[PDB]
């Protein structure tokens, strides 16, 4: 069930057991948290989930809690790696915003063997921002440079940035326990929505770049 936001353990990044998992490690992005919460763990291996924070960043700024998620798939012939972050709240100012935040970037490859980045999609309030072709100034090698930021009074959302960012231990949907996948599918995150549950393919359709 729901546990304290700061009591969800960080899920250690395992070794990649196959090429799917190795690719998601290889393309892990950088995140520049400009304002708002740092990313936190949303779920544990028993399927307990974060209770988040009431909108009211001192409670969500602990760098040791860093975590990133991913799920991989295909759409329209292209290979997609969705990276997703959970924040305990999305509150531009006191009395504005809501408990929980789920954001995601899609890294699009031509295919999983060639593994050329063809585009990037970053979640925002109106829908996905798209960089097509992927702007070289948003790439540190093959590492996408992403920002997390609220422009008041709008919710905190993702964007592309030239600034270097930080990385987090990655646990992939494909590496989770069944209890954790079940909890991410069924848990009510209120105004926020897990973007890599049974809605994954629908999100890829919205993130697609041409």
Q: How far is the CB of 65 from Mg ion (least distance, A)?
A: 17
Residue 15 sits at φ, ψ, to 5 deg, of -70, 145
Chain centre to alpha carbon of residue 176: 15
Out of 156, 158, 170, 183, the only residue in the binding site for Mg ion (CB under 5 A) is 156
User: Which of the residues 54 through 93 are near Mg ion (CB under 5 A)?
Assistant: 90
Which CA distances in Å does 179 have to 1, 46, 67, 82, 99? 11, 6, 18, 21, 23
Residue 6 counted as an annotated binding residue:
yes
CA angle 49, 145, 29 (to 5 degrees): 45
Residue 103 counted as an annotated binding residue:
yes
Q: How far is the CB of 90 from Mg ion (least distance, A)?
A: 4
Out of 128, 155, 160, 165, the only residue in the binding site for Mg ion (CB under 5 A) is 155
Decide if 183 contacts 47 (C-beta within 8 A).
yes
Q: How far is the CB of 23 from Mg ion (least distance, A)?
A: 26
Binding residues for Mg ion, per CB under 5 A?
Answer: 90, 101, 155-156
| Residues of the binding site for Mg(2+) | 6, 90, 101, 103, 156
């Amino acid at each position: 069930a729901v546990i304290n936001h700061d009591a969800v353990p960080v899920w250690p990044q395992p070794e990649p057991a196959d090429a799917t998992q190795a690719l998601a490690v290889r393309f892990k992005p950088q995140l520049d948290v400009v304002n708002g919460c740092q990313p936190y763990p949303a779920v544990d291996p028993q399927g307990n989930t974060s209770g988040g924070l009431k909108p009211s960043a001192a409670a969500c700024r602990d760098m040791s809690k860093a975590q990133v998620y991913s799920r991989s798939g295909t759409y329209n012939g292209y290979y997609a790696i969705m990276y997703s972050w959970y924040m305990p709240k999305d509150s531009p100012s006191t009395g504005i915003g809501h408990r929980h935040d789920w954001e995601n970037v899609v890294v699009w490859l031509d295919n999983a063997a060639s593994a050329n980045i063809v585009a990037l999609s970053a979640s925002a309030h109106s829908g996905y921002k798209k960089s097509f072709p992927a702007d070289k100034s948003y790439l540190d090698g093959i590492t996408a440079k992403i920002s997390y930021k609220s422009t008041w009074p709008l919710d905190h959302e993702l964007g592309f940035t030239t600034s270097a960012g930080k990385q987090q231990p990655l646990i992939q949907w494909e590496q989770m326990t069944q209890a954790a996948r079940d909890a991410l599918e069924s848990t009510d995150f209120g105004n926020a929505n897990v973007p890599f549950k049974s809605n994954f393919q629908d999100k890829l359709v919205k993130a697609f770049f041409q």
